[PDB]
Symmetry: C3
Subunit: 115 residues, 3 copies
């Protein structure tokens, strides 16, 4: 798969997703929502989409990653929407692992107004 | 796919899911959970289920979608289980986009007890 | 597929996923995140992975069910991670339905630096 940036890591065959990395250091206040930049651009194979889903490691810190859909056509850089549901401030360091990207098949069917 | 209603917009070949519009106005308080009607019913093809995932514009506001699994065997009105995990109350408007539905493939297996 | 435990129930061919039950009774103090044990091990068919999607009703009950990805190679016990987002202690009881597990396809490729 074609990519652009160093904010994503290869994965073993047994692994379902690629690790996404924070492009820069981030500080999330309590309850704050932030779109964290990864510095990566993707060229997803034709017929697939990328699912952004959290990693148990940062989830265990009171950080909820809000499910992200990466479209096949999307050509900008990937961003991870994250919320600090905890009651204190949290810091994500540069290049720290923050989420995963999973490539799933996509089915395109036109819509019909039947019954 | 056969659909009924107008709370779901068609999509492009480069798109992953079909947007889902709020059938009515919704006001969620901080930490409140409400199911949001879409007024859309549909027939999922054979061998596929429908996954409801939020759109980045609502996600970026602290709204998250809970249990968005639409079963192959389900013909009722689709409803979006939205929770406001932000620190303040937000209002979603009528016909405002609220989530996406991505048709994914079903994988049926029989569960067999055994050593793993 | 091969399972080892009691925390999982078979499904209808029209059902997208298998229900997960709470292994033991769990106390979640306010603002506490806890890996809810299920007591089941899996042997996911080759090429697939397991998607854990929280059960709507327990997200209303003041709990948030985090990142649920079971890798093809994972041979341990399945746990469901959750955070207590309310002002009171919430006790999850044994054999309580806490989530769903859906087997989905997985694409594997080498990452190549190019231009998009
Ligand atoms: O977690 C996410 C979600 C989205 N994106 C990007 C990539 C992608 O496919 C594109 C479009 O997201 P989308 O169209 O859902 O969100 P929107 O802001 O609600 O869009 P609009 O009304 O134009 O559909 O946004 C991310 O990087 N991360
Ligand atoms: O809801 C979940 C999420 C993960 N797991 C397990 C099973 C599985 O495939 C393995 C790995 O989780 P993961 O690798 O995401 O978390 P991490 O702690 O951040 O790991 P690392 O960077 O080493 O991968 O963790 C569960 O049982 N339930």
């Amino acid at each position: 798969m074609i990519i652009e940036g160093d904010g994503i890591l290869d994965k073993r065959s047994e692994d379902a997703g690629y690790d996404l990395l924070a492009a820069k250091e981030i500080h999330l206040l309590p309850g704050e929502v932030k779109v964290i930049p990864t510095g990566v651009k993707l060229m997803l194979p034709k017929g697939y989409w990328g699912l952004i889903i959290g990693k148990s490691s940062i989830g265990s810190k009171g950080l909820d990653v809000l499910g992200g859909v990466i479209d096949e056509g999307y050509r900008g850089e990937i961003g991870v929407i994250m919320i600090n549901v905890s009651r204190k401030s949290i810091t994500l360091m540069e290049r720290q692992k923050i989420a995963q990207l999973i490539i799933l098949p996509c089915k395109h069917e036109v819509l019909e107004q039947g019954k």
